[PDB]
Amino acid sequence: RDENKLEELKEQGFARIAIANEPPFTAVGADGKVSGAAPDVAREIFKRLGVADVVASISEYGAMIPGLQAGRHDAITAGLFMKPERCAAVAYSQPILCDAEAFALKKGNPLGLKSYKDIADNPDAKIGAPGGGTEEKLALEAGVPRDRVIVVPDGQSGLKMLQDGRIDVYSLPVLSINDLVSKANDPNVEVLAPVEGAPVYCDGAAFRKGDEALRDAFDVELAKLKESGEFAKIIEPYGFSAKAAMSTTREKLCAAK
Ligand SMILES: CC1=N[C@H](C(=O)O)[C@@H](O)CN1
C-alpha cells in the first residue's frame, strides 16, 4: 500500500477519489455518474494505468486532506488548489485545472465589494465560502473576522443564502460561479470576476506522501496527455485553459511566494 500502491489498485479494479460536487470542477448527475474536469482527467489517467474505474466520495474541501492522510481515499481530484501548506501535507501531481476567484453578488453591487479587503473593511459584510477552501482563507487573510466568513456547504446553498440576505457575497472560482449563476435564473444576482487582489490558482491530483510512486505514474500519463493535446480535449469543453496549466509547475505553485 506504499511503493506498490498502483499494483493493488489494479488488482482492486478501482481508485477512491475525493470530490466536492462543484461544476465544472466536479459534477454528479442524477444517474450517479461522476463527471467534471477533475474526475474525467483522473478517470482517463487511472484507466491508462490499468485501474478500471474510479469510486468517488463527496465531502467539503476541508475534510479532503485529512481523509487522504487517514487513508480513506487514494487521491483528491476536486480542484484542490496547490498552496505551500497543502503541498507540505500531500504529494501533488503537476498542474491540471487553473482558475481565478469570483464573487456572486447582489445586482448593482450595493456594498462596492470588489476585493476581499472590501469585505474586511465593512463590518456589515458577510462572505460565504466553502469550509477549508481558498476563498475562506483569503477572506481571513485580508482581515475578515471568523464570524463574518460563513461556511457554505455547496453552490446552490450559497446562492440561496445570498438571496436570503444571510451573506452579502458568495465566493468560488470564476468557472464555478459562472456555471452556478447561469443555471440560477436570477436577475438579482451578479458576477464580479476576477476578484481584485486575489491570486490565480491551479490544482493537481493530490496523493499521500507515501504514495509518491503512484503520483509519478499518474504524472507520466498527465504529461503524455498534455503533449498530444488530449489534455486540452478533456478540460477545455469545461472552460479551463490547457496552456495556463502547461505554463507553470507544481514547484512554482508550491513555492512560498
Ligand atoms: C475548485 C475549488 N477549489 C477551492 C480550494 O481548492 O480550496 C475551493 O475553495 C472552491 N472550489
Q: Is 216 helix (H, G, I), strand (E, B) or coil?
A: helix
Rounded Cα distance, 133 and 136, in Å: 6
- Is 172 touching ligand 1 by the criterion CB < 6 Å? yes
Quote the Cα angle for 247-252-254, to 5°: 130
Choice from 17, 77, 135, 171 to test ligand 1 binding pocket (greatest atom count within 8 A of CB): 135
Decide: residue 35, CB within 10 A, 0-12 exposed, 13-18 middle, 19+ buried.
Answer: middle
Rounded Cα distance, 248 and 230, in Å: 18
- Report which residue type is found at 133: G
- Is 59 touching ligand 1 by the criterion CB < 6 Å? no
How was this structure determined? It was done by X-ray
| Strand ranges, E, within the chain | 14-19, 27-28, 34-35, 53-58, 75-76, 91-92, 98-99, 101-106, 127-129, 149-151, 169-173, 189-192, 201-202, 206-207
CATH architecture of 100-201: 3-Layer(aba) Sandwich (3.40)
Q: Rounded to the nearest 5°, which phi and psi values hold at 170?
A: -115, 135
For residue 236, give the DSSP letter.
G
The C-alpha cell that represents 37 in the structure block: 474536469
Sign of CA dihedral 85, 88, 89, 92: positive
Choice from 86, 134, 171 to test ligand 1 binding pocket (greatest atom count within 8 A of CB): 134
Documented resolution in Å: 2.3
Assess whether the region 8-99+202-242 and the region 100-201 belong to the same CATH fold: yes
Rounded Cα distance, 164 and 168, in Å: 9
Does domain 8-99+202-242 match CATH 1.10.10.10?
no
Rounded Cα distance, 201 and 254, in Å: 11
Ligand 1, atom 2, lies closest to the CA of 79
Cα–Cα separations (whole angstroms), residue 72 to 64, 117, 228: 10, 37, 33
For residue 11, the CA-to-ligand 1 centroid distance in Å is 32
Instruction: Tell me the three-class secondary structure of 54-121, residue by residue.
Output: EEEEECCHHHHHHHHHCCCCCEECCCCECCHHHHCCCEECCCCCEECEEEEEECCCCCCCCEHHHHHH
Choice from 172, 179, 238, 254 to test ligand 1 binding pocket (greatest atom count within 8 A of CB): 172
The C-alpha cell that represents 47 in the structure block: 484507466
Q: Where are the domains of the chain?
A: 8-99+202-242, 100-201
> What long-range pairs does 156-164 form, CB within 8 A, spacing at least 24?
156/180, 158/104, 158/128, 159/104, 159/184, 159/186, 159/189, 161/128, 162/104, 162/105, 162/106, 162/128, 162/189, 163/188, 163/189
The C-alpha cell that represents 115 in the structure block: 476585493
Interhelix angle 174-184/155-164, rounded to 10 degrees, is: 60
